[PDB]
Design a binder for these strands. Sequence first.
DNA 1: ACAACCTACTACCTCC
DNA 2: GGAGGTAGTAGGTTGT
DNA 3: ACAACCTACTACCTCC
DNA 4: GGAGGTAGTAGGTTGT
Lengths: 750, 750
Amino acid sequence: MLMKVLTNMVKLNQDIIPNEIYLYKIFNKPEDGMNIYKIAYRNHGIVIDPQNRIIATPSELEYSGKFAIEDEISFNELPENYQNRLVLRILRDNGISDHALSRTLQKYRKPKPFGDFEVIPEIRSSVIKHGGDFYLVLHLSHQIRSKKTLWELVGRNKDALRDFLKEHRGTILLRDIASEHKVVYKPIFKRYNGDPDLIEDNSNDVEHWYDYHLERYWNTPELKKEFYKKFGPVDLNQPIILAKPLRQHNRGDLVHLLPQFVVPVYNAEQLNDILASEILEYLKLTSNQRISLLSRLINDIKTNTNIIVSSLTELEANTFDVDLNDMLQVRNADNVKVTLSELEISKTRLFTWMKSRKYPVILPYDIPQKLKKIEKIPVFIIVDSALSRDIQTFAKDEFRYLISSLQKSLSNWVDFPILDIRDKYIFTIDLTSDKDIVNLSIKLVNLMKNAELGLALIATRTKLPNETFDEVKKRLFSVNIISQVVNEATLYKRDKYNESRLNLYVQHNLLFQILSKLGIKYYVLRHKFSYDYIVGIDVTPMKLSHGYIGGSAVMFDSQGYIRKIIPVEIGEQMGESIDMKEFFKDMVVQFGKFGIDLEGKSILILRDGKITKDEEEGLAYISKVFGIKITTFNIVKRHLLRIFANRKLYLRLANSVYLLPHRIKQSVGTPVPLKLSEKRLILDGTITSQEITYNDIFEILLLSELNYGSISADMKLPAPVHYAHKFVRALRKGWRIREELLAEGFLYFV
Amino acid sequence: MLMKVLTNMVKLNQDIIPNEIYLYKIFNKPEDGMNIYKIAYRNHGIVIDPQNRIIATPSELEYSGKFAIEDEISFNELPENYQNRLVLRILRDNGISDHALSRTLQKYRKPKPFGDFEVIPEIRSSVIKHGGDFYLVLHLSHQIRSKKTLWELVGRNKDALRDFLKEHRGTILLRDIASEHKVVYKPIFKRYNGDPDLIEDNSNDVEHWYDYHLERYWNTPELKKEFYKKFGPVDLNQPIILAKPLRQHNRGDLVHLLPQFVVPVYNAEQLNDILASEILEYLKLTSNQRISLLSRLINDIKTNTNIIVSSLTELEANTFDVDLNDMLQVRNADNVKVTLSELEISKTRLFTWMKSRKYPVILPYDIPQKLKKIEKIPVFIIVDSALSRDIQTFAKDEFRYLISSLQKSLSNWVDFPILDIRDKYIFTIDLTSDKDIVNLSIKLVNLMKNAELGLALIATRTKLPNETFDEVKKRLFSVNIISQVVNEATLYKRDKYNESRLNLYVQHNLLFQILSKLGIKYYVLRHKFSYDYIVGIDVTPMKLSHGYIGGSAVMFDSQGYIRKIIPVEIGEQMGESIDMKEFFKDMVVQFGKFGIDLEGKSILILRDGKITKDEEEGLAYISKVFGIKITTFNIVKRHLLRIFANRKLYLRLANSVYLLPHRIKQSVGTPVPLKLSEKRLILDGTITSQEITYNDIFEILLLSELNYGSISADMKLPAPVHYAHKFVRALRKGWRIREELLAEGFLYFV
DNA sequence: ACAACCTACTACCTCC
DNA sequence: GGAGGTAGTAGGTTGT
DNA sequence: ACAACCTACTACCTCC
DNA sequence: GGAGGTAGTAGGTTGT
Ligand SMILES: [Mg+2]
Ligand SMILES: [Mg+2]
Ligand SMILES: [Mg+2]
Ligand SMILES: [Mg+2]
Ligand SMILES: [Mg+2]
Ligand SMILES: [Mg+2]
Ligand SMILES: [Zn+2]
């Protein structure tokens, strides 16, 4: 239970840590220009207080405007984040920058071409204080650029350019490289036809744009020679592309682009299958390759300066060896509770008793009451007409097999409603047609008049447009139908012994997802948690507006052995900042309409990202008024620290906990650890900082196993945060069901 | 039926109309600066095509950048809008500008002080082509500014400044006049306390900000003398105000302001009752004062140039003399249809039979079926605790009188459900407390468990905060309760003969609004319209995000004699542009789920504002695919043309119709006419322009009388546009009710 | 040349 | 969109 | 010094 | 927010 792990950080020399620093207050308006972070960066310092425009500098100020001397302090009187930023700024002053380390790294890893793209290695650096010393954290990445322009890519043909723009519609971006400001633009298509918008009747505007781009930016003879080398002569046979900026606010400013002056932004859609396979084998590196590359880079650094004083550091991590099958309760064939450790199976063999007799019969733990009151549930089969006929018949046969197997294996032991499939419930329509969607909606309303719940199985094409998918799912959710979508590439995965049937793994995942979408919880967790309610919060952007329809919470709650899941919504915000006062007000209203008093209890809040100061003030006001004790955690997924091990473990570094809660089943890649940081306790209006104990890590590890979407995959995030992310994904696309169905479970977003 | 009316436009000289013009194409990026409208204005021209950067100029170009000569054309080959813009640009070139006409106007109307504010007259000009000639339209307005700064307003006292900021919280704006860019800021208060955020412990930052504002902008000795005259010496006893910009996007940039350097933006909240009475008597001018002032101004203009060649023009308008009581059907005391002209009454005596016997008994035309199935409806009385005790008892007594009178007068003749008032249904809570709101919501959920519809009567204070009103109404609408709110200033309006009762006008309006909120249509319209469906569309901004949750439609529909009102929602947009494809798709889905086929019918679309080109393309695609014939109108409320008459009339001017559909009951003010413009017919994918006939004006005038909010007030807008505006007002604040209640009428937003 | 994070998409591999 | 990981691209929010 | 419109708020008066 | 008008203040969207 004590293992030595290797990380990607090195110890720095302590002779670069500054002795004394000065604070300066800058007197200027935001509404003029010359941003305060730029003033701090040009004056070799950092920003402490953005509210009062206070900067910290290890040297004397050389500012041209008005300033005032605030204070003379030491380096140890600062918070640790500002110390890390100051050490990083001094390291960038002393020649240790990201692009110089990229220059050093490219001597051992040459740029590699893949088709029409080029991959170049890259180092990203950070500073972490641990044990009184500062460590430089290095992270390996790659940059994939285009070595050819758009006009030279298609062979200087207009029809090839039209086919390239029409084929990759939806994820095509063009970057202008002939201007001083390299802006990324998106091409504009016809809204109802889909053709690209080009002007192929202007041989004079092309010459005017060519001469304007030549005379405005490339004015020196060396710049003229570089322009004639890079782009060559003017081609008057090329069209003019209509494009908008990728930035949302200047999207109403039309831009005329030349295909000779733009390059395509890299996407993996623009490659074939083979080159995609080699490029994703090349980008994903294992732990040993990263260790060797970082060791070669650090050995190159250490023979040129005296800053790096050590190799890759070895830390101590505590392993997690706990059988999770002891805490997973389920029903047996007689409907009696039992842990899968007593049945000597795992989570992944819940449905193997359907077609075999050498395995115990597993019945679900919880069935909702509304499913018991409901006599029949209609099941519809919607098939896209763009598929081949054998794929259509195979999809209908697999849907009939799936529903019949579920109906037999559930009706032989427990009280389940009848899923009705009729020959008039099967439709084969074109999904990209609006009239077919409208007629299918009319027919499904006329079929589901005297009913409360229905199920649909949709079979789509290989590459359906993203608007059509959201439209079909939203129109099905508005008419009280839970839908499950299977694409064409999924239907090509067959069993190794039976080629005429689907793969059994996909059938079991579809069984579990269909059962979980109607509120059935097959297995629950048995653990007496220290908190009565566990609330997970996540935010997502809105699709059309510049705001946030995302912002929702998922509550795990019970009497003390957590079984119940309820999702609620924050509402609508302007940025990424939850109004906790309104959130807790409708939380108390909803839980009091359930019959539970939310006064004097304990609530554990897991927030995806970082808790802002406005959220802290709202939680303090809620704790002062309603008298609730709140414990908040901060979960971070994307950082630069990497642990070179593939095992369930955790590591205490600085004031954070980096845990690996799963193992990577692939043979390529390094797992990204999860960061727990800034445990806050709010009680009676006062916020205190706490220490992350072993019980919090153990409870988060236990909450990371409550997966209702699949039986063979282990997720990284805890279950309330994961279901909050799926709920804001559902609410972003406009997907909604009735309220009392949301109160009885019914995880329709999984 | 032929009356001569006077307008506010004068004929221009025809020797200023240009002979020939040139077109120029400008080659520059939007992402650099130097906007194309500024290039057109500095080069004495206008912009024709913003897509292709095409400008029109009557003279030769003097541009420094790259340009190309497009074409040489005449003035008569342009559209009329571009001709009006060119004539307006030439008039601003020849000295006829708005501020110079304001200089001319201030000789006859001196600036007038009201308290601490100053009112100055102002002329706004436009150009309208009519009959082959161009007319300059002049519009009278006023500008009210502040003659004193914020520090001199409160008497240079910190407690008076704190009381002034705390009293006018919510509508306080401060403009900085010590900078080159005059930006309007909003002060920042505490989120849960309400106190202003001031720094009264900095005698050094005030001097630094004073010296910085002195040395940055006012650097010349004349500017230093003007700065010392305007602001005087530095006061080090003043605090520093924390403020944000009023512009939404830079609201995260904190600004430190000095109260000596800022002025208060004018609001009528900052005046007493007497000064508000004189200032609104002074701002609202009748027709004769505007005629005399414009005649004096035009007589001053005509003796200085040769451009204006006539006085105020007299046009011909057609009067509307049609008795609207013939087309208003209602039920009698035998439930038999009858027009109020047969009963020899009007719209305004529908409830006078309740307390009198010399008037006929009037029963409503339509009662919804769901009200007939419902046996009982609970009625709650919520009273704010901030009121005085006599006001509380008077509000409860008036609510009991209102419900008892409605119950008796409706139960004696027709089949009405019983409105239940119990002694436990009356609550007296503090509305500004969150815990009282939460407990009231819990109690109302526990009281309305086995019920489908309830009614609430709320009595609030004089000045309730706008967040609390929306919160209370949203929490009542979420628990299936229709609410009606009466404030404290409404309860002080008593009858002239009975001082212990409410005014009978307010009681009748509350009766009609309460009856209309539960789907009861008292009177309908009898007219065979030329269109099967009439759809009104309006948009409103979202509260917190930068987008548009507004965008909704109201459909007036029947078999041909319009009686049924259904509101639907567009969804969520980015700007002011309706996606007509999705709107018509869920329209066909909703009307087919009602059992009506929407193929081959005619739909009249009334849009609040102007129909964009994307809406035109969407309507063309909908008409091509679904085969619907669409007729679109454009309704304009705010323009510069004024008709100096107080009578129902219409006037054909240019290609638009300016109608006065109502009379102003006040003794001050000039009525603003409504503009009908750009009648479009879309059939089989082609959009043609039509002419506004007499039948369209007559049908719009008939639709302008379908008011369900009051019986004594005549609205200007047509009824679908008005109800669309009220529906986006409801959906902006988050107010929503169940679906099948929305399908059965139930105008909850009136 | 402002950092440390967070979304939205595309692609491959691997499970019982 | 069988569900979960890892890779890449482009933007946007928050420090106080 | 870009026009013609559209929101969001505050205030008074007038109805049977 | 009795409902409708007219007055003022500040911003924001669309021309093609
Ligand atoms: Mg997040
Ligand atoms: Mg998320
Ligand atoms: Mg799913
Ligand atoms: Mg509008
Ligand atoms: Mg409106
Ligand atoms: Mg109302
Ligand atoms: Zn925005």
